[PDB]
Amino acid sequence: MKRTWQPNRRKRAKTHGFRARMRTPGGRKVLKRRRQKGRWRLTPAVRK
Amino acid sequence: AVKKFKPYTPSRRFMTVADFSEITKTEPEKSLVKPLKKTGGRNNQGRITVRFRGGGHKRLYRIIDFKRWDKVGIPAKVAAIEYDPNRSARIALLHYVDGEKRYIIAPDGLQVGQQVVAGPDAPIQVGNALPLRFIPVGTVVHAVELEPKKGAKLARAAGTSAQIQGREGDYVILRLPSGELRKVHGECYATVGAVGNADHKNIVLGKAGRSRWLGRRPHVRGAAMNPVDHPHGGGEGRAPRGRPPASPWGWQTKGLKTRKRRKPSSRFIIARRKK
RNA sequence: CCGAGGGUAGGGCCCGUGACUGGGGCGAAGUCGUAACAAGGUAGCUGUACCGGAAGGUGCGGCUGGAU
RNA sequence: UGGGAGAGGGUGGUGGAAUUCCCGGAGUAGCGGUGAAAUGCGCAGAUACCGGGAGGAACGCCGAUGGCGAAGGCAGCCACCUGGUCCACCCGUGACGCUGAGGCGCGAAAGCGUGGGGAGCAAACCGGAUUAGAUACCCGGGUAGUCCACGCCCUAAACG
RNA sequence: CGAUGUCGGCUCGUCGCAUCCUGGGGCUGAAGAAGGUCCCAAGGGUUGGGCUGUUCGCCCAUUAAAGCGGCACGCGAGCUG
RNA sequence: GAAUGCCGGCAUGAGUAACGAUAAAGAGGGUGAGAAUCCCUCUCGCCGUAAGCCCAAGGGUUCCUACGCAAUGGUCGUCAGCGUAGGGUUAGGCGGGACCUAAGGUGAAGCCGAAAGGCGUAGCCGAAGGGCAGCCGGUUAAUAUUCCGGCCCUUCCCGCAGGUGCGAUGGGGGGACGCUCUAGGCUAGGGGGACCGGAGCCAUGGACGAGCCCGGCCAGAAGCGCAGGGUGGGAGGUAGGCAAAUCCGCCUCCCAACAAGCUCUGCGUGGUGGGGAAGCCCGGGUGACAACCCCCCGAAGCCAGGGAGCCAAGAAAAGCCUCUAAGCACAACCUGCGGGAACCCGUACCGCAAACCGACACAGGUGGGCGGGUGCAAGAGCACUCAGGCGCGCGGGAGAACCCUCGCCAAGGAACUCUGCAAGUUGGCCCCGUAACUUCGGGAGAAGGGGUGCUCCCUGGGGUGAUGAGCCCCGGGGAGCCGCAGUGAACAGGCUCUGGCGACUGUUUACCAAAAACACAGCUCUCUGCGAACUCGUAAGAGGAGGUAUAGGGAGCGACGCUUGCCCGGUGCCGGAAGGUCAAGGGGAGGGGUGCAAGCCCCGAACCGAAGCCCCGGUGAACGGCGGCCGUAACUAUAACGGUCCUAAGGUAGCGAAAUUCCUUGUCGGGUAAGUUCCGACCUGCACGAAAAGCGUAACGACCGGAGCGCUGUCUCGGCGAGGGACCCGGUGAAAUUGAACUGGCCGUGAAGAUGCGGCCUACCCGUGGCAGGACGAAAAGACCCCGUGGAGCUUUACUGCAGCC
RNA sequence: GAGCUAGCCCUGGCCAGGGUGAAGCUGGGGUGAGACCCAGUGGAGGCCCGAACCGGUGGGGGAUGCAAACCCCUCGGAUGA
Ligand SMILES: CC(C)C[C@@H]1CCO[C@@H]2[C@H](CN[C@@H]2C(=O)N[C@H]2[C@H]3O[C@H](CCC/C=C\[C@H]2C)[C@H](O)[C@@H](O)[C@H]3O)C1
Ligand SMILES: [Mg+2]
Ligand SMILES: [Mg+2]
Ligand SMILES: [Mg+2]
Ligand SMILES: [Mg+2]
Ligand SMILES: [Mg+2]
Ligand SMILES: [Mg+2]
Ligand SMILES: [Mg+2]
Ligand SMILES: [Mg+2]
Ligand SMILES: [Mg+2]
Ligand SMILES: [Mg+2]
Ligand SMILES: [Mg+2]
Ligand SMILES: [Mg+2]
Ligand SMILES: [Mg+2]
Ligand SMILES: [Mg+2]
Ligand SMILES: [Mg+2]
Ligand SMILES: [Mg+2]
Ligand SMILES: [Mg+2]
Ligand SMILES: [Mg+2]
Ligand SMILES: [Mg+2]
Ligand SMILES: [Mg+2]
Ligand SMILES: [Mg+2]
Ligand SMILES: [Mg+2]
Ligand SMILES: [Mg+2]
Ligand SMILES: [Mg+2]
Ligand SMILES: [Mg+2]
Ligand SMILES: [Mg+2]
Ligand SMILES: [Mg+2]
Ligand SMILES: [Mg+2]
Ligand SMILES: [Mg+2]
Ligand SMILES: [Mg+2]
Ligand SMILES: [Mg+2]
Ligand SMILES: [Mg+2]
Ligand SMILES: [Mg+2]
Ligand SMILES: [Mg+2]
Ligand SMILES: [Mg+2]
Ligand SMILES: [Mg+2]
Ligand SMILES: [Mg+2]
Ligand SMILES: [Mg+2]
Ligand SMILES: [Mg+2]
Ligand SMILES: [Mg+2]
Ligand SMILES: [Mg+2]
Ligand SMILES: [Mg+2]
Ligand SMILES: [Mg+2]
Ligand SMILES: [Mg+2]
Ligand SMILES: [Mg+2]
Ligand SMILES: [Mg+2]
Ligand SMILES: [Mg+2]
Ligand SMILES: [Mg+2]
Ligand SMILES: [Mg+2]
Ligand SMILES: [Mg+2]
Ligand SMILES: [Mg+2]
Ligand SMILES: [Mg+2]
Ligand SMILES: [Mg+2]
Ligand SMILES: [Mg+2]
Ligand SMILES: [Mg+2]
Ligand SMILES: [Mg+2]
Ligand SMILES: [Mg+2]
Ligand SMILES: [Mg+2]
Ligand SMILES: [Mg+2]
Ligand SMILES: [Mg+2]
Ligand SMILES: [Mg+2]
Ligand SMILES: [Mg+2]
Ligand SMILES: [Mg+2]
Ligand SMILES: [Mg+2]
Ligand SMILES: [Mg+2]
Ligand SMILES: [Mg+2]
Ligand SMILES: [Mg+2]
Ligand SMILES: [Mg+2]
Ligand SMILES: [Mg+2]
Ligand SMILES: [Mg+2]
Ligand SMILES: [Mg+2]
Ligand SMILES: [Mg+2]
Ligand SMILES: [Mg+2]
Ligand SMILES: [Mg+2]
Ligand SMILES: [Mg+2]
Ligand SMILES: [Mg+2]
Ligand SMILES: [Mg+2]
Ligand SMILES: [Mg+2]
Ligand SMILES: [Mg+2]
Ligand SMILES: [Mg+2]
Ligand SMILES: [Mg+2]
Ligand SMILES: [Mg+2]
Ligand SMILES: [Mg+2]
Ligand SMILES: [Mg+2]
Ligand SMILES: [Mg+2]
Ligand SMILES: [Mg+2]
Ligand SMILES: [Mg+2]
Ligand SMILES: [Mg+2]
Ligand SMILES: [Mg+2]
Ligand SMILES: [Mg+2]
Ligand SMILES: [Mg+2]
Ligand SMILES: [Mg+2]
Ligand SMILES: [Mg+2]
Ligand SMILES: [Mg+2]
Ligand SMILES: [Mg+2]
Ligand SMILES: [Mg+2]
Ligand SMILES: [Mg+2]
Ligand SMILES: [Mg+2]
Ligand SMILES: [Mg+2]
Ligand SMILES: [Mg+2]
Ligand SMILES: [Mg+2]
Ligand SMILES: [Mg+2]
Ligand SMILES: [Mg+2]
Ligand SMILES: [Mg+2]
Ligand SMILES: [Mg+2]
Ligand SMILES: [Mg+2]
Ligand SMILES: [Mg+2]
Ligand SMILES: [Mg+2]
Ligand SMILES: [Mg+2]
Ligand SMILES: [Mg+2]
Ligand SMILES: [Mg+2]
Ligand SMILES: [Mg+2]
Ligand SMILES: [Mg+2]
Ligand SMILES: [Mg+2]
Ligand SMILES: [Mg+2]
Ligand SMILES: [Mg+2]
Ligand SMILES: [Mg+2]
Ligand SMILES: [Mg+2]
Ligand SMILES: [Mg+2]
Ligand SMILES: [Mg+2]
Ligand SMILES: [Mg+2]
Ligand SMILES: [Mg+2]
Ligand SMILES: [Mg+2]
Ligand SMILES: [Mg+2]
Ligand SMILES: [Mg+2]
Ligand SMILES: [Mg+2]
Ligand SMILES: [Mg+2]
Ligand SMILES: [Mg+2]
Ligand SMILES: [Mg+2]
Ligand SMILES: [Mg+2]
Ligand SMILES: [Mg+2]
Ligand SMILES: [Mg+2]
Ligand SMILES: [Mg+2]
Ligand SMILES: [Mg+2]
Ligand SMILES: [Mg+2]
Ligand SMILES: [Mg+2]
Ligand SMILES: [Mg+2]
Ligand SMILES: [Mg+2]
Ligand SMILES: [Mg+2]
Ligand SMILES: [Mg+2]
Ligand SMILES: [Mg+2]
Ligand SMILES: [Mg+2]
Ligand SMILES: [Mg+2]
Ligand SMILES: [Mg+2]
Ligand SMILES: [Mg+2]
Ligand SMILES: [Mg+2]
Ligand SMILES: [Mg+2]
Ligand SMILES: [Mg+2]
Ligand SMILES: [Mg+2]
Ligand SMILES: [Mg+2]
Ligand SMILES: [Mg+2]
Ligand SMILES: [Mg+2]
Ligand SMILES: [Mg+2]
Ligand SMILES: [Mg+2]
Ligand SMILES: [Mg+2]
Ligand SMILES: [Mg+2]
Ligand SMILES: [Mg+2]
Ligand SMILES: [Mg+2]
Ligand SMILES: [Mg+2]
Ligand SMILES: [Mg+2]
Ligand SMILES: [Mg+2]
Ligand SMILES: [Mg+2]
Ligand SMILES: [Mg+2]
Ligand SMILES: [Mg+2]
Ligand SMILES: [Mg+2]
Ligand SMILES: [Mg+2]
Ligand SMILES: [Mg+2]
Ligand SMILES: [Mg+2]
Ligand SMILES: [Mg+2]
Ligand SMILES: [Mg+2]
Ligand SMILES: [Mg+2]
Ligand SMILES: [Mg+2]
Ligand SMILES: [Mg+2]
Ligand SMILES: [Mg+2]
Ligand SMILES: [Mg+2]
Ligand SMILES: [Mg+2]
Ligand SMILES: [Mg+2]
Ligand SMILES: [Mg+2]
Ligand SMILES: [Mg+2]
Ligand SMILES: [Mg+2]
Ligand SMILES: [Mg+2]
Ligand SMILES: [Mg+2]
Ligand SMILES: [Mg+2]
Ligand SMILES: [Mg+2]
Ligand SMILES: [Mg+2]
Ligand SMILES: [Mg+2]
Ligand SMILES: [Mg+2]
Ligand SMILES: [Mg+2]
Ligand SMILES: [Mg+2]
Ligand SMILES: [Mg+2]
Ligand SMILES: [Mg+2]
Ligand SMILES: [Mg+2]
Ligand SMILES: [Mg+2]
Ligand SMILES: [Mg+2]
Ligand SMILES: [Mg+2]
Ligand SMILES: [Mg+2]
Ligand SMILES: [Mg+2]
Ligand SMILES: [Mg+2]
Ligand SMILES: [Mg+2]
Ligand SMILES: [Mg+2]
Ligand SMILES: [Mg+2]
Ligand SMILES: [Mg+2]
Ligand SMILES: [Mg+2]
Ligand SMILES: [Mg+2]
Ligand SMILES: [Mg+2]
Ligand SMILES: [Mg+2]
Ligand SMILES: [Mg+2]
Ligand SMILES: [Mg+2]
Ligand SMILES: [Mg+2]
Ligand SMILES: [Mg+2]
Ligand SMILES: [Mg+2]
Ligand SMILES: [Mg+2]
Ligand SMILES: [Mg+2]
Ligand SMILES: [Mg+2]
Ligand SMILES: [Mg+2]
Ligand SMILES: [Mg+2]
Ligand SMILES: [Mg+2]
Ligand SMILES: [Mg+2]
Ligand SMILES: [Mg+2]
Ligand SMILES: [Mg+2]
Ligand SMILES: [Mg+2]
Ligand SMILES: [Mg+2]
Ligand SMILES: [Mg+2]
Ligand SMILES: [Mg+2]
Ligand SMILES: [Mg+2]
Ligand SMILES: [Mg+2]
Ligand SMILES: [Mg+2]
Ligand SMILES: [Mg+2]
Ligand SMILES: [Mg+2]
Ligand SMILES: [Mg+2]
Ligand SMILES: [Mg+2]
Ligand SMILES: [Mg+2]
Ligand SMILES: [Mg+2]
Ligand SMILES: [Mg+2]
Ligand SMILES: [Mg+2]
Ligand SMILES: [Mg+2]
Ligand SMILES: [Mg+2]
Ligand SMILES: [Mg+2]
Ligand SMILES: [Mg+2]
Ligand SMILES: [Mg+2]
Ligand SMILES: [Mg+2]
Ligand SMILES: [Mg+2]
Ligand SMILES: [Mg+2]
Ligand SMILES: [Mg+2]
Ligand SMILES: [Mg+2]
Ligand SMILES: [Mg+2]
Ligand SMILES: [Mg+2]
Ligand SMILES: [Mg+2]
Ligand SMILES: [Mg+2]
Ligand SMILES: [Mg+2]
Ligand SMILES: [Mg+2]
Ligand SMILES: [Mg+2]
Ligand SMILES: [Mg+2]
Ligand SMILES: [Mg+2]
């Protein structure tokens, strides 16, 4: 049947993207936390 | 004159439709329309704030002239009468001798080709607009402003009217369509006559899908719901109300008055509605 | 080929009968009340409506085939 | 052809009396109701009186033993649209008449559908009396309905 | 109770005997025929249908007879549900 | 040494199940160490509204070539979407951007919020919508509307000429719109040709033929032709289009009007440029100077912004055209022609799937376009087939039980069973014919029947064409032929009678309920006079609604018909300027602490003093509620009638053993041989009853009952047959479970059901196919039941608070 | 976190073929005029049959699955809420 993951590059970028994150207080704490942890990537990769 | 159908489907048994016989023009005036932005009953938060809305036919808004003191003294000709999907009334296309064009809501009796005019001096004729003080007592009147220069507010839907009862200083006394008696300032404008399309109330929607076309989504009874949802929700089997009948939010809904007690407009309301 | 008739399927009129049910007729001395004939004790009758154990009562309008 | 009387019919308008309710004022201990009462209403200011307002329904006197209509039925006053009918004159047609199974139309009240309207009245209903009872008669309330539009119903002591 | 699946049916049997029939007896208020009552006997047999989820029970048509009980009210790692 | 402990390793089950659609294979020849599995050829089968082809998304090198086979591939592997390396994606016109706006988002101004932040007209962003210029063919191992060829076109810059009051983000026009149905004319696409071109072929009995087999086009600027769209021209006035305006709108007058003209599209033609089969020979070469023509069918596509009808009344903005304002009129803009200029990103490949979403090369899921022919009434249905693509990444045998999926069956025909569950039957089209009842539509495909192929002959009408021929479409009559059978295969209703419920079409518990549930038109009550009520938000601000009582919120009921009774004492809500109670506050009789005192400081009665509550009324389609005992008729029985207690009032009409009736399978009647169900009645209704509506109701239902006919492997009662498994052999090889085991029966015993204890009996050691009685077999720390001063949802006249309202 | 699912908003797309035959309109009849009747035309509808597409009624299979909801047969809607 239709499963839950239906990839869509625009959707991915507009929801989880670096700019979406910078716009809200909580998104910035995400960026700050994944920085402090040392994540190689702070935000999902989409081809664009 | 509502029109019937032969019972050739279960729903055509009872369906009635308007006759559309006063209509003389069947596409609107390009310069006077704009898109009517549908809401679904959602507010600027996106939350439903009026349940069960959405899904109706697409519509354009037709700008209606609810002031008419905009153009004192300038007569206009009744060019056309048109269907308006944003209101129960029909609407009348007006060509002013100016060249300006404008819609009004179409009074009862109004014929294409006649002239109407607005102002303190206009004739007392179906279609004219005067401040209330200059309209003789007993006149049936529609599209009444409620405060001067603020726009016509009262008696706008199909078939309605207000009646001028008496005068008192700067105010006149109107009997509104609800039967309330109210003081409305004499400088408030009003249009002579009743609103047209009086047969509107006798239309039988006839099928569920027709409510859908109007943007009315199905209404769910509280008695059908659960207690998380509604005072009347719950119960094994059917259940009577079991408490004073109530709204989803818990206030009582059989009798409980709701006009704010200390409202300044009370001084101008002589007598609440009847019946 | 047509053909008595036999078979299949579906209708129409009639007759008989049927748990139960509707009033109707009749029947020497049953029970309830007293509507009508006298102004019958609320003049009567009446078409209709609604109501009531029952006759009946009341509304509306009609008639005199009503008294004084 | 000329004239007549008439609540004949339909539409629109509109005029005063009365009842009810609302507002103001003035006033106080009862009002109402009956065979007698009681229920009801009233000092939270009624009844009785004066002024203003709203709204519906019916048109006093004239009015008659009257008038008009085929019948049912028709009554303030006004305009309009319309039927019947009679008289005069003796002009026109030249029996073109009478009745009329079916058919079609009209048809008090009540009642029914859809809107409206709702003052007074009032089936149903509630109450108070009366009574052995009183699902009545009398009294206090009161909903359909009584009114308007359109559509049905088609009955009668629709009788002379 | 860190689970011993529960009513009825179906299928498959197997056992007890306080025996429904068939076999053998005694008594009879046993003439015969046919019954009643008790004793011995478990080898074999013990039908089909209508109603109900039913077990049971009632009924229809038969039969020599249409037995009553146990097996976790036998049988869901065999089925049904 | 135990914690269903934690991490890791390794066992058992076991050479066991399985190897992923039952579309299917066989042989020859190659290659190689090795071949059912790679390549090639021949034969066979499968898809063909796809299992073929093209877009979009998503994926991201998977593409092509060489070299590989450890692992990945459910087996093998020389092969591969695998490993290594090299190569491969070319645009002014295709798609996106340097254009436009939609929802939405963001946001000068501005508003609001302890902070963070929330709003917000303009404006800006935002597309699969608008707008905009490229078609055909060839080339590569791999890209192509991108390279190349041919023929076309767009914008920008600059110049020449010619024309004009030029000029904008401002005004205006246009852009610009629905649903159904649809005319004419074309095009795509298709069928036929006795005509045109072609390598050939004559077989096995016949055919050298008007034979068979193959093919008979594509793109094209101007001009021209056919078919369509869009559009009146002039004058005078002018106060409106937030400045101006010669434009637009509005009034007038004259002329033009089913037209025409102008303009813009589509189709045809068109200079010219391409393509071009079978077959044969080694993707290529030939065919080939290839031929390229006639007729028929014909779109849902095109002309298009076409036409009609309808109600539910159908985006915006830019491009573009026109008007003018500053300005400027040496400019500028319009037209024509010439030269020059024209950027960024994508482009490989997969794409109904082995490359995307599902952990897998997973029988599942994934939007748009094309989707050929024949016959079957039509069609995208079905069967077979074209082009093209496949045989589904384990095979070889055998021919047991048993399971799956399938075919048939004597006599019987529902006897099966909770139930005809399941499977039969029926089955398309044409014609005849068709009942109760009904809201007049319907019920209806009611039921039930007859016809159906082929051949000859005669004949009616239509489309194209020409009025004819030919081709094509609808028929009509007669006479025949064959078979068991003519919708000869495939696709394709079983029917009726009668109840319950719900009017109806719809909706639902994604993944155990599709229903009688929810919704529904319709009915009623109630709130709301607009800065409405109500809702979301601390607020600003939104929705309501750019609506206004014929409207908006809430609530119950649920098409329609006939109806909807009595109770207002309690609760609710509505009304009541009196009375009672009533907080802060007012008032301050009278006290008190302290101080020499002036004073300072505290307590404080009467009385005035909101809402609420009390109190007086109203109100049921507001919450609700609608009696008991005893007596009585000239047979008996039963009570129309009476008595008395109680109530706020004592259940009306209608219905009734009911989706409600306990006793109960009530009783009677019907249907049956037989009927706890069913239907019809009765009424002592345990415990119906009137908008949590009462009683009916045509039509409707994958709803739940009862009966009958038809027909059956459901059954008496089973038999045989097919294929996929099971079984054997080669290859690959799991799983839960598992204290260890050298693991029999009886009768006892035991913590009360023993392989393991006692006594007896029985029993050589080890497997394979099978069956399920036991190992209180596995699975899951019982979901029932209790217990814990465990949890959570929900309710209220439990307590206590809070929002909100007064 | 609404790339699943529920609702709404904006903008697009899709629904083979066949059947039934409403209103209106035309003509005829009818009447004083009418209503109304008859035939033709017409092409309505939460109309009918049936693909695509959307569903998920009954049974069977599957049940360490092809699959953490699938497969076969059957069945509902298919111009509309
Ligand atoms: C009067 C009765 C209520 C008495 C009651 C009957 C219920 O069961 C029995 C109780 C007594 N214990 C039984 C039980 O728990 N049995 C369970 C079974 O659950 C699976 C089978 C399917 C589920 C059925 C039963 C559940 C409860 C599982 O496979 C079985 O091993 C078994 O665990 C008594
Ligand atoms: Mg889903
Ligand atoms: Mg995307
Ligand atoms: Mg996207
Ligand atoms: Mg997205
Ligand atoms: Mg976001
Ligand atoms: Mg972002
Ligand atoms: Mg912050
Ligand atoms: Mg910060
Ligand atoms: Mg790094
Ligand atoms: Mg992140
Ligand atoms: Mg109708
Ligand atoms: Mg009708
Ligand atoms: Mg109209
Ligand atoms: Mg516009
Ligand atoms: Mg809005
Ligand atoms: Mg917003
Ligand atoms: Mg937001
Ligand atoms: Mg709401
Ligand atoms: Mg809503
Ligand atoms: Mg409105
Ligand atoms: Mg309108
Ligand atoms: Mg005012
Ligand atoms: Mg209405
Ligand atoms: Mg609408
Ligand atoms: Mg509604
Ligand atoms: Mg509802
Ligand atoms: Mg509920
Ligand atoms: Mg519920
Ligand atoms: Mg919730
Ligand atoms: Mg709660
Ligand atoms: Mg609650
Ligand atoms: Mg409740
Ligand atoms: Mg409930
Ligand atoms: Mg209940
Ligand atoms: Mg419930
Ligand atoms: Mg109730
Ligand atoms: Mg209750
Ligand atoms: Mg409540
Ligand atoms: Mg009011
Ligand atoms: Mg014979
Ligand atoms: Mg006696
Ligand atoms: Mg009398
Ligand atoms: Mg008497
Ligand atoms: Mg008397
Ligand atoms: Mg009398
Ligand atoms: Mg009475
Ligand atoms: Mg008093
Ligand atoms: Mg006083
Ligand atoms: Mg009034
Ligand atoms: Mg004479
Ligand atoms: Mg009458
Ligand atoms: Mg009357
Ligand atoms: Mg009394
Ligand atoms: Mg007495
Ligand atoms: Mg009244
Ligand atoms: Mg008389
Ligand atoms: Mg237990
Ligand atoms: Mg365990
Ligand atoms: Mg247990
Ligand atoms: Mg267990
Ligand atoms: Mg059996
Ligand atoms: Mg003897
Ligand atoms: Mg024996
Ligand atoms: Mg035995
Ligand atoms: Mg039994
Ligand atoms: Mg029993
Ligand atoms: Mg018995
Ligand atoms: Mg014997
Ligand atoms: Mg036993
Ligand atoms: Mg026992
Ligand atoms: Mg027991
Ligand atoms: Mg047992
Ligand atoms: Mg058992
Ligand atoms: Mg089981
Ligand atoms: Mg069992
Ligand atoms: Mg078991
Ligand atoms: Mg077992
Ligand atoms: Mg077991
Ligand atoms: Mg230990
Ligand atoms: Mg473990
Ligand atoms: Mg542990
Ligand atoms: Mg561990
Ligand atoms: Mg290790
Ligand atoms: Mg391990
Ligand atoms: Mg290991
Ligand atoms: Mg070992
Ligand atoms: Mg092993
Ligand atoms: Mg082996
Ligand atoms: Mg094994
Ligand atoms: Mg396995
Ligand atoms: Mg497998
Ligand atoms: Mg298959
Ligand atoms: Mg198969
Ligand atoms: Mg082979
Ligand atoms: Mg090989
Ligand atoms: Mg090999
Ligand atoms: Mg193979
Ligand atoms: Mg090969
Ligand atoms: Mg095909
Ligand atoms: Mg990937
Ligand atoms: Mg390998
Ligand atoms: Mg190897
Ligand atoms: Mg290998
Ligand atoms: Mg491997
Ligand atoms: Mg695999
Ligand atoms: Mg090799
Ligand atoms: Mg490449
Ligand atoms: Mg180019
Ligand atoms: Mg640039
Ligand atoms: Mg954006
Ligand atoms: Mg775009
Ligand atoms: Mg081109
Ligand atoms: Mg337009
Ligand atoms: Mg528009
Ligand atoms: Mg558009
Ligand atoms: Mg429409
Ligand atoms: Mg072409
Ligand atoms: Mg063709
Ligand atoms: Mg060409
Ligand atoms: Mg001007
Ligand atoms: Mg060639
Ligand atoms: Mg050549
Ligand atoms: Mg199409
Ligand atoms: Mg078009
Ligand atoms: Mg058009
Ligand atoms: Mg806009
Ligand atoms: Mg200047
Ligand atoms: Mg100059
Ligand atoms: Mg120019
Ligand atoms: Mg640039
Ligand atoms: Mg490419
Ligand atoms: Mg698929
Ligand atoms: Mg596709
Ligand atoms: Mg692939
Ligand atoms: Mg595979
Ligand atoms: Mg797959
Ligand atoms: Mg072809
Ligand atoms: Mg066909
Ligand atoms: Mg295969
Ligand atoms: Mg396949
Ligand atoms: Mg074998
Ligand atoms: Mg066969
Ligand atoms: Mg047989
Ligand atoms: Mg039979
Ligand atoms: Mg038979
Ligand atoms: Mg049966
Ligand atoms: Mg068939
Ligand atoms: Mg019948
Ligand atoms: Mg019939
Ligand atoms: Mg019938
Ligand atoms: Mg019937
Ligand atoms: Mg009929
Ligand atoms: Mg038939
Ligand atoms: Mg024939
Ligand atoms: Mg033949
Ligand atoms: Mg069928
Ligand atoms: Mg239903
Ligand atoms: Mg339902
Ligand atoms: Mg019902
Ligand atoms: Mg009904
Ligand atoms: Mg439907
Ligand atoms: Mg569930
Ligand atoms: Mg479910
Ligand atoms: Mg689930
Ligand atoms: Mg299911
Ligand atoms: Mg359910
Ligand atoms: Mg269903
Ligand atoms: Mg539901
Ligand atoms: Mg319904
Ligand atoms: Mg109703
Ligand atoms: Mg109402
Ligand atoms: Mg709130
Ligand atoms: Mg708030
Ligand atoms: Mg705050
Ligand atoms: Mg608004
Ligand atoms: Mg509402
Ligand atoms: Mg409902
Ligand atoms: Mg309904
Ligand atoms: Mg009460
Ligand atoms: Mg009261
Ligand atoms: Mg009360
Ligand atoms: Mg109150
Ligand atoms: Mg107070
Ligand atoms: Mg109660
Ligand atoms: Mg009570
Ligand atoms: Mg009654
Ligand atoms: Mg009964
Ligand atoms: Mg019943
Ligand atoms: Mg009951
Ligand atoms: Mg019972
Ligand atoms: Mg019982
Ligand atoms: Mg019985
Ligand atoms: Mg019987
Ligand atoms: Mg019965
Ligand atoms: Mg009884
Ligand atoms: Mg109930
Ligand atoms: Mg009923
Ligand atoms: Mg019914
Ligand atoms: Mg009826
Ligand atoms: Mg249904
Ligand atoms: Mg159903
Ligand atoms: Mg049957
Ligand atoms: Mg069998
Ligand atoms: Mg076999
Ligand atoms: Mg062997
Ligand atoms: Mg091996
Ligand atoms: Mg392996
Ligand atoms: Mg051991
Ligand atoms: Mg051992
Ligand atoms: Mg052993
Ligand atoms: Mg052993
Ligand atoms: Mg024991
Ligand atoms: Mg033992
Ligand atoms: Mg042992
Ligand atoms: Mg031991
Ligand atoms: Mg031992
Ligand atoms: Mg021992
Ligand atoms: Mg031992
Ligand atoms: Mg021993
Ligand atoms: Mg032994
Ligand atoms: Mg073996
Ligand atoms: Mg074995
Ligand atoms: Mg076992
Ligand atoms: Mg066991
Ligand atoms: Mg155990
Ligand atoms: Mg066990
Ligand atoms: Mg489990
Ligand atoms: Mg635990
Ligand atoms: Mg436990
Ligand atoms: Mg558990
Ligand atoms: Mg549970
Ligand atoms: Mg317990
Ligand atoms: Mg405690
Ligand atoms: Mg404790
Ligand atoms: Mg607790
Ligand atoms: Mg809690
Ligand atoms: Mg708080
Ligand atoms: Mg409130
Ligand atoms: Mg998605
Ligand atoms: Mg669309
Ligand atoms: Mg469709
Ligand atoms: Mg037909
Ligand atoms: Mg026709
Ligand atoms: Mg027409
Ligand atoms: Mg339909
Ligand atoms: Mg059909
Ligand atoms: Mg299924
Ligand atoms: Mg589904
Ligand atoms: Mg089945
Ligand atoms: Mg499962
Ligand atoms: Mg399936
Ligand atoms: Mg199927
Ligand atoms: Mg269908
Ligand atoms: Mg269709």
B123 CA from centroid of ligand 5 (Å): 61
- Asked whether residue B70, judged by its CB, lies under 7 Å from any atom of the DNA or RNA strand F, the reply is no
Nominal resolution in Å? 2.5
Method: X-ray
- Asked whether residue B98, judged by its CB, lies under 7 Å from any atom of the DNA or RNA strand F, the reply is yes
Strand partners, B129: B118, B191
Burial group, residue B82, by CB count within 10 angstroms (0-12, 13-18, 19+): buried
Coil, helix or strand at residue B81:
strand
Output the distance from B28 CA to F264 C1' rounded to whole Å: 27
Task: List C-alpha distances in Å: B112 to B23, B81, B93, B120, B215.
Answer: 10, 7, 9, 24, 32
Taking the C1' atom of F700, which residue's CA lies nearest? Answer: B10
- Asked whether residue B21, judged by its CB, lies under 7 Å from any atom of the DNA or RNA strand G, the reply is no
B108 CA from centroid of ligand 39 (Å): 44
Between CA B237 and CA B235 the distance in angstroms is 6
Nucleotides of D under 7 A from a protein CB: 53-55, 114-116
Between CA B222 and CA B175 the distance in angstroms is 36
Dihedral angle over CA of B242, B245, B246, B248, nearest 10: 70
Output the distance from B260 CA to F800 C1' rounded to whole Å: 31
Neighbours of ion ligand 22 (CB under 5 A): B 83-84, 90
- Asked whether residue A36, judged by its CB, lies under 7 Å from any atom of the DNA or RNA strand G, the reply is no
B86 CA from centroid of ligand 218 (Å): 100
Between CA B197 and CA B201 the distance in angstroms is 9
B165 CA from centroid of ligand 156 (Å): 96
- Asked whether residue B45, judged by its CB, lies under 7 Å from any atom of the DNA or RNA strand F, the reply is yes
Dihedral angle over CA of B17, B22, B23, B29, nearest 10: -130
Q: Do residues B71 and B99 make contact, with C-beta atoms less than 8 angstroms apart?
A: no
Task: List C-alpha distances in Å: B118 to B20, B50, B145, B255.
Answer: 28, 38, 14, 42
Nucleotides of G under 7 A from a protein CB: 1-5, 7-11, 22-23, 44-47, 69-70, 80-81
Between CA B178 and CA B173 the distance in angstroms is 14
B57 CA from centroid of ligand 12 (Å): 22
Contacts of B58 (CB under 8 A, 6+ apart): B38
Q: Which of B41, B63, B43 is nearest to B52 (CA)?
A: B41
B203 CA from centroid of ligand 26 (Å): 13
Between CA A32 and CA A39 the distance in angstroms is 10
Dihedral angle over CA of A9, A11, A15, A16, nearest 10: -20
